[PDB]
């Protein structure tokens, strides 16, 4: 359910590092 970010859109299907920033860009 909450795999996709509940606010910002992550460019890739990784994880939403909303605690640190937006997206971790870890691919």
HSE of 8, CA atoms in CB hemisphere, 13 A:
14
Q: CA dihedral defined by 1, 22, 9, 13, rounded to 10 degrees?
A: -60
Contacts of 16 (CB under 8 A, 6+ apart): 4, 5, 6, 8, 10, 22, 23
Residue indicated by tokens 């605690």: 19
Please state the domain extents for the chain: 1-27
| Beta carbons of 14 and 26 less than 8 angstroms apart | yes
How was this structure obtained?
NMR
Rg of the chain taking only CA atoms, in angstroms: 8
């Amino acid at each position: 359910l909450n795999n996709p970010c509940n606010g910002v859109t992550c460019p890739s299907g990784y994880r939403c590092s909303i605690v640190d920033k937006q997206c971790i860009k870890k691919e």
